[PDB]
Design a protein around this ligand. Structure first.
Ligand code: E22
Length: 180
């Protein structure tokens, strides 16, 4: 419903299409010149943000208090424009909704929205060796390259799509304290 209406504006305002040595991803700007990517996108010194070279001043691969992986990488971008501060839409702890929307903006999947249904606090996952935490699960046969689409609901940004097993698809929960 207004889930979609909410999501198009988010992607219009704060999203971009990023390419790295590891493939094409969806990127979400959080505030200032900070954005998030799936950790496994492994951005180096620069990245292709909507086909232009934007430099990456700093990058923190995010982890637990236990050091456990969280599959989130924070990017300070070297560009003038500030993003819109969407931290007000981020939860303090993982969120479960019955109706949720996954949104991708890559060249393979340009500007597409998916009524993905029910998100549940899946918690732990061993993702190709890498044990990662605070996962959100949904029953949709996602694929490459839909990382790292954005998981939303009415006025919530829930997480960032980082993996899938061909039947379910998983998102790294996107919490407030990840950003001061
Ligand atoms: N685009 C894009 C992403 O690279 C892609 C989306 C996947 C692909 C598969 C099919 N379903 C999806 O959505 N994610 C990926 O490719 C991630 C990358 C990753 C590597 C290491 C740690 C965490 C994440 N990997 C996976 O999703 C596969 C993990 C897995 C496989 C078998 C059994 C249990 C877990």
């Amino acid at each position: 419903g207004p889930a979609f209406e909410f999501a198009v504006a988010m992607m219009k305002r704060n999203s971009s299409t990023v390419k790295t040595e590891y493939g094409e991803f969806t990127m979400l700007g959080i505030y200032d010149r900070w954005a998030v990517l799936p950790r496994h996108s492994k951005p180096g010194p620069t990245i292709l943000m909507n086909d232009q070279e934007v430099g990456v001043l700093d990058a923190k691969e995010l982890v637990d208090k236990d050091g456990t992986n969280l599959e989130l990488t924070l990017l300070k971008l070297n560009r003038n424009e500030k993003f819109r501060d969407i931290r007000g839409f981020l939860a303090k702890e993982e969120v479960e909704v019955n109706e949720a929307v996954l949104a991708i903006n890559t060249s393979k999947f340009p500007n597409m929205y998916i009524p993905v249904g029910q998100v549940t606090e899946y918690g732990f996952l061993n993702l190709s060796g890498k044990p990662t935490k605070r996962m959100l699960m949904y029953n949709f046969p996602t694929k490459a390259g839909q990382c790292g689409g954005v998981l939303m609901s009415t006025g919530k940004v829930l997480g960032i799509h980082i993996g899938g097993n061909g039947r379910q698809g998983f998102s790294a929960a996107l919490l407030k304290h990840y950003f001061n």
